[PDB]
Design a protein around this ligand. Structure first.
Ligand SMILES: CCCC/C=C/C(=O)N[C@@H](Cc1cc(F)cc(F)c1)C(=O)N[C@H]1COC(=O)[C@@H]2C[C@@H](C)CN2C(=O)[C@@H](C)NC(=O)[C@@H]2CCCCN2C(=O)[C@@H]2CCCN2C1=O
Ligand SMILES: CCCC/C=C/C(=O)N[C@@H](Cc1cc(F)cc(F)c1)C(=O)N[C@H]1COC(=O)[C@@H]2C[C@@H](C)CN2C(=O)[C@@H](C)NC(=O)[C@@H]2CCCCN2C(=O)[C@@H]2CCCN2C1=O
Ligand SMILES: CCCC/C=C/C(=O)N[C@@H](Cc1cc(F)cc(F)c1)C(=O)N[C@H]1COC(=O)[C@@H]2C[C@@H](C)CN2C(=O)[C@@H](C)NC(=O)[C@@H]2CCCCN2C(=O)[C@@H]2CCCN2C1=O
Ligand SMILES: CCCC/C=C/C(=O)N[C@@H](Cc1cc(F)cc(F)c1)C(=O)N[C@H]1COC(=O)[C@@H]2C[C@@H](C)CN2C(=O)[C@@H](C)NC(=O)[C@@H]2CCCCN2C(=O)[C@@H]2CCCN2C1=O
Ligand SMILES: CCCC/C=C/C(=O)N[C@@H](Cc1cc(F)cc(F)c1)C(=O)N[C@H]1COC(=O)[C@@H]2C[C@@H](C)CN2C(=O)[C@@H](C)NC(=O)[C@@H]2CCCCN2C(=O)[C@@H]2CCCN2C1=O
Ligand SMILES: CCCC/C=C/C(=O)N[C@@H](Cc1cc(F)cc(F)c1)C(=O)N[C@H]1COC(=O)[C@@H]2C[C@@H](C)CN2C(=O)[C@@H](C)NC(=O)[C@@H]2CCCCN2C(=O)[C@@H]2CCCN2C1=O
Ligand SMILES: CCCC/C=C/C(=O)N[C@@H](Cc1cc(F)cc(F)c1)C(=O)N[C@H]1COC(=O)[C@@H]2C[C@@H](C)CN2C(=O)[C@@H](C)NC(=O)[C@@H]2CCCCN2C(=O)[C@@H]2CCCN2C1=O
Ligand SMILES: [Cl-]
Ligand SMILES: [Cl-]
Ligand SMILES: [Cl-]
Ligand SMILES: [Cl-]
Ligand SMILES: [Cl-]
Ligand SMILES: [Cl-]
Ligand SMILES: [Cl-]
Ligand SMILES: [Mg+2]
Lengths: 188, 180, 189, 185, 181, 182, 191
């Protein structure tokens, strides 16, 4: 957890490497998506918006996905705040991670040459995470359709195409993800 | 802990009167939220406070501690549902200052109160049936008051362990506006 | 994760956790099960605040299911001894030792919030030995139970016989009913 | 909660009270906490060898030799060491309470004191140490002699009464000679 | 205990000199920290070389690929030094440093072999299927062939056996440019 | 919980006054910390005495020997004070303080006996063999005989028994020079 | 781990005891050798070289040994950097710890009077530490020979002597380690 120190007008101040990159409006979405990591990302997005509502924000995504409602919290925050939120896939983006990648500002969604994208949403992401919550079948079907509609909107694919392809738990290459409309450009 | 030395990201947002109510509700996190509310009131008793809620609910008496603090302090307490709000989280969402309760478009709200929230959390305490029924009625009355629904409607609907969409929560009176 | 509030001092920044910041305004939090560890921190806070200003009121906000009797008694004795008035506010709940400490605040300065609940009942668990090599014997339990009843009768104005009969019941009183019983002076609404 | 205060430098609440020559002896007595108390006693003596030191005791007792380390340090250092029982003091905790400077041993009204020394306190705490019967009898006698000296009770009285694992009230502890005064306002 | 120097911990102090340590098994957590360090150093100075010292048995393929893609994209040359060992993804990243700036110490060892473990799903709900494994194995061989100068089939043959190369043999194979003595 | 007094912890405050605490079981981790403290204090002032307060049941022999060798090498006199107890390696280090500057408190107890546990391998891949144990036992006995003034034969006989000496009896035996009273 | 505080121009600055000694070019190699602790030692060696490539560095060794390749990372760094790296055995040095002890700058390898040195290399140090790595027999034999060649070079013993003696899992005393060529001098007394 490396640090970097900057000498300011009021002394020297230390950051961890992630906080230092946050100073440059860089957010890291890494690891499984759950409530804890989704809320810290929402907090970072809101912080950057208040600091400057005009400059783009960048989310670097390396994630196998995870909890749907946690991912939706990030999605809604990305869409609401004034700044454009650019997304870059490094490593992989699956399930909710793939959805958030595809939901970056139009024209500003990127994948690196060896990254991979899987839109498939496993059952695990829809189930209750709290002991006392049982997520029922109809709520799952509603959420699955809602996610498909979001993907269709941001990719330009038809709803029927998204619904067919999301059943398959296969990865798309960066080139294939770009052609599908999940990202705008492969960075080479 | 996205952190600088000499705030973490949450403490930094607290400086702007923003409180995060995230994860299961229990005594530990409820008392931290009570402490934040009291701090912000003393710092400025006129300015609005904002609680962003992403919670599956939890312990009833812990949630009631937050509810009573929200109602007593002078500042308006605005509530925003991000992700979900269930049980006590849903109640606290609906209990924000009138006109200042918000939900994001893909958030979901479930008023249903599972048994787990009423049971004793301490080893030596058994919460008895009559106390559970009293608390359930009190929660229904709080929801009816803040939503504008009748006591029947809350009492009938709270049996269903189902989520309302943001639009449906707004129509029900659980929030005032969907931020879109 | 406990939030910080950091202030700028003469040569940089100075950080408090949220509880330490509220302590600066003479606010003490009694939260969770009562045991030796948390009781001694509360005793330490009370003594600190007295030395800082022996005249100004101290406030203890109570959200506790109770716990160890002797740990609670350490707080009780410290509250009574120090010069400042100790005001008590029930938030959430106060049971067993938590209810006793709530009822033992300075006269006229004991408060409950509208949805808080108070149970004076003292379960056996609070009287048993907490150390491996300590067995708390029956007569010591009966002595402590009577002592607690006498403390409650004194601070509530109820008779000893009323307290002894009612402390049986493992029932909660509402904030209004606790006020009528003499456990608090006023419901803050 | 490890609460903080800032003074004109930051302290935890216990460190802040240490600045006022206040030491907390809380929880089971073992080597780790006894050595911290010894260190605090030595620190306060060097800072000012004249002013009284105060040890507030809330403890069920514990390891005998660890308590003896505290006892020997209390007796050696120049300052009077005043002792205050809050909550309870048992076994080594009761011995240390009774061993404060004469006239400066206090108990709060609802505190309780038990001199009884259970076997557990005498047994080896290290894996490779077995504390043998004669060493236990020697330690028990020394503890009884220490209590007799500081209480004014006879050795025979201490030896008989320490067998009983009963608590004394604060008033009864004062009458027995374990403390000098019950603090009431 | 990680030592400090004046205040930095030793690793943060070396980061100030554009030194990154890739140590231990490669997974998402450590790969993202390395990506963050690479991006920080590029922004601080996009012209000065960056150095990654590698002592790793390898690990998760996609995590390593995240490091690879970041090394290739940023402007600074990324020099690589093998200390101790480099296996699997560790060996690939070592071989992927800037041409002419890949080093091994005399008693270092390099194994390009990629065990199955690195390709399997690390998340509970992800099953990495056979054809995706074959695609990744092929990509890795192509990356090694490009940076070593060996032919694709030569890499495919040699990566099958889980043997280490000495520093001298790794240099002759094209995995590093020079043995530092 | 360690109290503070920047904030020092209480032990760091006392290190500023050349006070080192040897407390708890002796192992590599705590022995190296004590060695580091001894070397720091020597470099800070090679003339002033150093004080080690000992409350320990003993422990790993080679770790204790690291402390012994450092105590003997450095220029400052190293004074030792037994508080609570000193057993096995703890007792050896107590007896190995600077001549005339080894102290015990009135209720402290000292046991020179060395249990088998201290000689066995602590690392997974190390087996300490019988002859190495006997060599170390002899080396420890010679150290005790040298610093106490007792004969080697006396040490070898008395170390066999797992019994404690009182502070007075430890002083008479030559394990400490003086019992501190008043 | 204790702290020492030094007064600066702006107030106080704190070190842990090990970091304070690092400021005087002192490195502690303590406990089992593995990748994590070896990389910290490599980092310290490189820092001290850049801070001053002329002054000696000191490694105090109290270790039962451990992972061979992690120790080799330390060995290669000691040999490459410009400063002489002096080694001092405190307590014990076994396997890789003994090799690194013997690999200090010629004339600057020391043992304390009650320290002990065992060159024997147990199988455990050669086995794979990661789940997916199996270290095969010939690689073990190659590494064992390489270690024997390093010891023969630095001790002056013949390769055949090292190979024979290393089989035995016995400790040498400080005096015997000095006579064998594993250290140059036993620090018996301070001059
Ligand atoms: C970092 C320090 C500032 C914190 C940033 C908060 C913020 O951006 N909230 C979003 C609401 C939101 C929350 C969330 F968790 C996810 C999400 F997608 C959206 C917001 O509404 N932003 C406002 C500016 O913020 C505010 O006006 C206040 C004050 C600020 C301390 C936090 N206010 C709010 O949370 C809400 C309640 N905002 C408002 O009161 C206004 C008034 C009508 C309701 C919504 N509002 C807005 O959209 C305002 C009007 C003009 C632009 N306009 C924002 O961007
Ligand atoms: C950081 C420093 C300020 C911290 C804020 C504390 C605070 O707001 N407490 C609530 C009581 C409360 C606590 C809780 F946990 C939940 C909850 F819903 C309500 C409160 O009463 N606030 C007072 C202002 O605070 C005070 O007057 C004092 C001092 C302060 C250190 C805390 N006092 C109190 O605890 C209570 C007992 N205050 C009072 O005595 C006054 C007069 C008697 C009735 C209660 N009081 C008030 O309500 C006063 C009247 C005018 C404004 N008025 C508050 O809001
Ligand atoms: C941060 C610096 C001050 C910390 C506060 C300590 C304090 O108030 N202790 C209580 C005793 C007590 C302890 C406890 F754990 C629980 C409890 F309910 C009561 C106390 O006695 N307070 C004194 C003022 O403090 C003192 O005089 C001394 C010095 C101070 C460093 C701590 N002294 C004590 O511990 C005791 C022994 N106090 C006394 O010596 C005096 C003299 C006769 C015995 C009791 N004393 C008092 O009551 C004094 C006399 C005037 C008022 N009077 C206090 O409030
Ligand atoms: C914050 C820095 C100071 C820390 C306090 C140490 C201290 O008070 N040690 C006790 C011995 C002791 C240790 C212990 F763990 C428990 C216990 F009950 C007693 C002590 O002897 N105090 C001395 C003053 O301290 C010293 O002279 C030296 C220097 C100081 C760094 C620590 N010295 C000692 O450890 C011992 C060895 N003291 C002495 O050398 C003197 C000389 C004759 C032997 C004993 N000494 C004393 O008792 C002196 C004589 C009168 C004043 N006199 C102390 O109180
Ligand atoms: C102040 C701290 C800077 C931190 C460095 C970030 C960085 O270098 N990102 C890479 C993208 C990347 C991310 C990753 F995780 C791995 C990887 F291999 C590559 C990048 O694109 N760098 C840019 C310079 O950075 C930017 O322009 C912006 C702003 C900065 C805050 C981070 N921008 C970006 O994330 C992306 C989206 N960059 C761009 O917008 C430009 C526009 C065209 C598409 C990509 N861009 C570039 O390639 C720019 C223009 C030419 C050189 N060119 C970079 O090096
Ligand atoms: C805070 C900075 C100084 C840290 C103290 C180190 C120290 O005292 N080491 C002992 C050796 C030792 C280590 C150990 F872990 C246990 C032990 F019992 C003994 C030492 O040798 N002390 C020297 C002074 O230190 C040095 O000269 C150098 C430099 C210093 C950074 C560390 N050097 C050493 O480690 C060794 C190698 N010392 C020497 O080079 C000299 C030269 C002849 C061989 C040993 N040396 C000495 O004895 C020197 C010469 C005069 C007295 N003389 C020390 O006190
Ligand atoms: C506090 C900041 C400096 C940190 C010290 C790093 C260092 O000394 N690395 C060794 C290589 C090495 C690494 C390792 F993990 C173990 C090991 F045994 C050896 C090194 O090469 N040192 C150089 C000076 O450092 C450098 O020139 C650059 C820059 C520095 C940030 C780290 N460079 C390097 O990694 C390598 C690649 N060095 C070089 O580029 C030069 C060029 C020719 C090949 C290797 N080099 C050297 O050996 C240089 C030339 C003269 C001596 N010469 C060093 O001391
Ligand atoms: Cl129910
Ligand atoms: Cl009984
Ligand atoms: Cl026996
Ligand atoms: Cl034996
Ligand atoms: Cl060992
Ligand atoms: Cl073998
Ligand atoms: Cl094999
Ligand atoms: Mg000496």
């Amino acid at each position: 957890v490396p640090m970097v120190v900057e000498q300011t007008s009021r002394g020297e101040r230390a950051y961890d490497i992630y906080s230092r990159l946050l100073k440059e409006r860089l957010i890291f979405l890494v690891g499984p998506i759950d409530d804890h990591m989704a809320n810290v990302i929402v907090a970072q997005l809101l912080f950057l918006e208040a600091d400057n509502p005009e400059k783009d924000i960048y989310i670097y995504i390396n994630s196998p996905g995870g909890v749907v409602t946690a991912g939706m919290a990030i999605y809604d925050t990305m869409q609401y705040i004034k700044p454009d939120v650019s997304t870059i896939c490094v490593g992989q983006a699956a399930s909710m991670g793939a959805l958030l990648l595809a939901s970056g500002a139009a024209g500003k969604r990127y994948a690196l040459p060896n990254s991979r994208v899987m839109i498939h949403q496993p059952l695990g992401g829809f189930q209750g995470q709290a002991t006392d919550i049982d997520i029922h079948a109809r709520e799952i079907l509603t959420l699955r359709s809602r996610l498909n509609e979001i993907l269709a909107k941001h990719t330009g694919q038809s709803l029927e195409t998204i619904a067919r392809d999301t059943e398959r738990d296969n990865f798309k290459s960066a080139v294939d993800a770009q052609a599908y409309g999940l990202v705008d450009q492969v960075l080479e």
